Amino acid sequence: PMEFEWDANKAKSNLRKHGVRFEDAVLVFDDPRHLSRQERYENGEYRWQTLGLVHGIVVILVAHSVRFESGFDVIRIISARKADRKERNRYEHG
């Protein structure tokens, strides 16, 4: 089972700078075709990046962490922006 967390101020800044809501960034994990890569171990968790389609309208790139607890996992949303040409190409054809 999975739960989501983030810093509320980081969410507001992300919307200001990049135009993506963290509440919509969470929805990439509901896209069965989402594409994920692991970057590093950071502050006790693994950092990942995930591409997915939100509301059938736009492919977004989400920077997040994953942590394993007793009976549930937690994803922390860190940043999100629109995917660019190369990233859309990996999401569609990778």
Binding site: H18, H34, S36, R37, H55, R81, R90, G94
Partner: protein, 44 residues
Amino acid sequence: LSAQHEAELKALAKKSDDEIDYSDIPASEDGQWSEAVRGKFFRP
């Protein structure tokens, strides 16, 4: 979705790659996405 929320997503869908800000999540290359997993965190 509300009409306003839908409109935000359609505006984002029309943004050109020139308008993307890479200052928090840098640009990638195909090689950095060689070990990716599809559906990694999908829960039905």
